[PDB]
Design a protein around this motif. Structure first.
Motif, mmCIF file in Angstrom:
data_model
loop_
_atom_site.group_PDB
_atom_site.id
_atom_site.type_symbol
_atom_site.label_atom_id
_atom_site.label_comp_id
_atom_site.label_asym_id
_atom_site.label_seq_id
_atom_site.Cartn_x
_atom_site.Cartn_y
_atom_site.Cartn_z
ATOM 1 N N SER A 40 0.831 -1.191 0.000
ATOM 2 C CA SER A 40 0.000 0.000 0.000
ATOM 3 C C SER A 40 0.875 1.255 0.000
ATOM 4 N N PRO A 41 0.460 2.306 -0.726
ATOM 5 C CA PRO A 41 1.192 3.574 -0.780
ATOM 6 C C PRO A 41 0.924 4.475 0.424
ATOM 7 N N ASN A 74 8.907 8.027 2.523
ATOM 8 C CA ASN A 74 8.021 9.170 2.791
ATOM 9 C C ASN A 74 8.348 10.324 1.839
ATOM 10 N N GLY A 75 8.784 9.959 0.641
ATOM 11 C CA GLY A 75 9.099 10.949 -0.366
ATOM 12 C C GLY A 75 7.872 11.374 -1.142
#
Length: 17
Positions: free
Chosen positions: A3-4, A11-12
């Motif tokens: 999952s994104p 955390n970019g």
């Protein structure tokens, strides 16, 4: 596969909102 979630690892690109 995964999952994104905001800090998916770097955390970019927080594809959250």
């Amino acid at each position: 596969y995964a999952s994104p979630k905001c800090f998916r690892y770097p955390n970019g690109v927080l594809a959250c909102t």
